């Protein structure tokens, strides 16, 4: 008659054994079974690699003439409730959930005998909803926050403001043009401070919404420099609180991992996916890849189109370092001539800037891109590709640029000829000065030519690398180079803006049928043909860009984010939902 407790740790002697995290025995007992499956779905099984570097042809050909579109297995498993799941009229889905950690799937029957492949479930949140519904993980995130004593800087008003921006559809496409041309350099940002100052002032005074919340780079730069007299303050408090919360999430995540370390490295790498270095943010403007190759012990194979990448030594032969604009004072003409004399299709070389160690381990970029954005916006965003030469031609070939007569400081709209920039400025309801367009056309010298897409392949941790087949030891991820994410567009906007931009399906949080059908005519046709596609999970992206199995964030993370509530409780939920389900993560969960 002693009251004995039995917590997680006391049983840990059986949970951290590698017998638990191995799919070899599951795969044996499965493969040997008769009656293979008779439904070996093939969609999104593995990535397909292109020869042509252009993504516009990829998206066009993939959505050009489309028909009945398949939906993946996990997107179906995460749709049923628990009680409807366990009912034995949905059996083929139960039949493929033998093991909690390994998500298993069957290949195409033709070509070889029946075989099944298991891919590891990287994080807690990829556990399907009928086995861990949304409310469970909401409460678990609340519990985590109470454990680490994290104090929310962000107030709900700033989140409601972010969301009211996310559902604007009256968003100025010109603020988007500027945000696209800057592409994350300090010097060009300091070149154009009065431009964005006027922009933020007008967008915060005409309506109660704040612009430029899209790219993490503009947020960092505004908090870093324009904290001064930038705008009418009231708006600066928003950016203050945003960056403060971005740092407080890392305060908590560091407090989760112990002070104790494995060897030279700490243990914080293995417990949360955000803290791990091998994860890459979707929008990249600096040289992150080669730095990753320098830091990654596990073979971090990069794929640029058809061309592989595995060595720091080939750094010149595949990556063109974009010089600092001043150092390039002499090399402008050769760069410009390369556009007319160089075939950008299948270039297989990347134009990137020199890397800057922020001094944070890039945790902030991952936290803003993976937790804050999909929660505060219900994940309604896409990637965007741009043709920068059209942007230059719209900006520089304008009337006020050439005429030596026109003064430096005037309302361009009075002297503006009929051209697409007129319509853009009018729909963006902002009247800019001549100096600002001069500075924008000046920023052309550095800017890249087109936007590019890259694949990363990182081996898992040594704690979960136990697997039968080497292909499963890899984990795949997509990275955007020289591009930006976008909110929903308008229809009247997509008359002068289609002249410059195009839509991209992306990471689950940044893949959305609403936005992509808004931008593309063809994706709109596709969604109208098949309305069930409205959901973020059932959307079909080109395998050349997206593979639903072999990713960090599976479908259920996106499904939860679709119904995510804008409170900070759900922010805690999305934060804690990034734990890796590795034994050394179970130990840290036991400690707290």
């Amino acid at each position: 008659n002693l009251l004995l407790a039995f917590n997680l740790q006391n049983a840990l002697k059986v949970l951290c054994h590698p017998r638990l995290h191995t799919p070899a025995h599951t795969l044996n007992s499965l493969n040997a079974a008769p009656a293979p499956r008779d439904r070996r779905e093939t969609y999104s099984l593995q990535h397909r690699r292109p020869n042509h570097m252009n993504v516009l042809v990829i998206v066009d050909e993939f959505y050009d003439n489309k028909y009945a579109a398949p939906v993946t297995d996990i997107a179906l498993k995460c749709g049923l409730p628990t009680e409807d799941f366990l009912h034995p009229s949905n059996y083929d889905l139960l039949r493929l959930e033998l093991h909690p950690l390994y998500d298993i799937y069957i290949g195409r029957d033709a070509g070889e005998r029946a075989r099944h492949r298991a891919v590891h479930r990287l994080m807690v949140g990829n556990l399907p909803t009928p086995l861990a519904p949304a409310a469970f993980q909401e409460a678990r995130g609340q519990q985590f926050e109470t454990a680490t004593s994290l104090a929310h800087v962000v107030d709900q008003a700033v989140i409601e403001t972010v969301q009211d921006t996310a559902y604007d559809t009256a968003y100025p496409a010109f603020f988007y043009v500027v945000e696209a041309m800057i592409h994350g350099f300090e010097e060009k940002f300091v070149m154009n401070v009065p431009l964005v100052s006027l922009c933020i002032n007008t967008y915060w005074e005409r309506s109660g919404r704040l612009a430029f919340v899209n790219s993490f780079s503009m947020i960092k730069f505004i908090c870093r420099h324009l904290g001064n007299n930038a705008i009418s303050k009231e708006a600066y408090s928003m950016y203050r609180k945003i960056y403060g919360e971005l740092i407080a999430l890392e305060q908590a995540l560091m407090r989760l991992a112990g002070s104790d370390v494995v060897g030279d490295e700490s243990v914080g790498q293995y417990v949360c996916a955000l803290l791990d270095p091998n994860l890459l943010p979707p929008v990249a403007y600096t040289d992150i890849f080669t730095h990753l190759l320098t830091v990654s012990d596990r073979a971090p194979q990069i794929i640029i189109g058809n061309e592989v990448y595995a060595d720091t030594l080939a750094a010149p032969q595949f990556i063109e370092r974009v010089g600092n604009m001043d150092e390039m004072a002499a090399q402008f003409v050769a760069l410009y001539g390369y556009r007319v004399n160089g075939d950008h299709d299948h270039d297989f070389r990347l134009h990137l800037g020199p890397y800057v160690d922020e001094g944070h381990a890039d945790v902030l970029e991952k936290i803003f891109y993976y937790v804050f954005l999909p929660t505060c916006t219900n994940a309604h965003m896409c990637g965007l590709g741009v043709d920068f030469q059209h942007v230059a031609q719209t900006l520089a070939y304008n009337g006020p640029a050439f005429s030596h007569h026109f003064t430096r400081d005037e309302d361009i709209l009075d002297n503006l000829e009929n051209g697409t920039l007129r319509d853009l400025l009018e729909i963006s309801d902002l009247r800019p000065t001549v100096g600002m367009i001069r500075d924008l056309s000046a920023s052309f010298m550095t800017c890249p030519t087109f936007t590019r897409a890259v694949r990363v392949s990182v081996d898992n941790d040594v704690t979960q690398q136990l697997a039968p087949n080497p292909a499963d030891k890899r984990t795949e991820q997509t990275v955007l180079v020289n591009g930006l994410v976008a909110f929903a567009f308008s229809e009247r906007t997509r008359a002068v803006t289609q002249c410059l931009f195009h839509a991209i399906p992306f990471h689950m949080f940044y893949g959305d049928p609403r936005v992509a059908a808004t931008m593309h005519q063809d994706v709109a046709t596709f969604v109208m043909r098949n309305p069930q596609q409205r959901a973020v999970e059932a959307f079909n992206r080109p395998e050349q860009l997206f593979a639903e199995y072999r990713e960090w964030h599976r479908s259920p993370m996106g499904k939860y984010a679709a119904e995510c509530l804008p409170s900070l409780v759900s922010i805690s939920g999305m934060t804690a939902m990034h734990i890796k389900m590795s034994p050394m993560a179970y130990i840290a969960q036991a400690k707290l």
Binding site: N54, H390, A396, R438, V496, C499
Partner: protein, 77 residues
Amino acid sequence: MARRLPKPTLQGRLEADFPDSPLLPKFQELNQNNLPNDVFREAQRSYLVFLTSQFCYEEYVQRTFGVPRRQRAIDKR
């Protein structure tokens, strides 16, 4: 197999309309022995864009220096 972009609508013959510019002499050396007229005009507009961008950056550079002491020394007396 690559689509470029639809195109922006834009006003033509702008440089030939505007009489005076430093850009016209450096611009004249834009030869076309092979390219058709409309491709030539796409290339020409691109060339003007580059020239204007060069002029604008040089303008900002001459903006950078600020004020030295000697000018205030001269004028303030």
